[PDB]
Design a protein around this ligand. Structure first.
Ligand SMILES: *Cc1cccc(C*)c1
Lengths: 19, 19
């Protein structure tokens, strides 16, 4: 599910940015 | 939130494996 991964990556990527 | 990212990465990583 590449699409699911992409969405999750955003959350993980965004979460990392937040701290 | 590195910890949040790690958890999300697993979901994204696992999701990718599923397809
Ligand atoms: C979007 C993403 C890139 C590299 C590693 C993770 C877990 C997520």
């Amino acid at each position: 599910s590449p699409e699911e991964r992409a969405q999750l990556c955003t959350a993980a990527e965004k979460a990392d940015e937040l701290g």
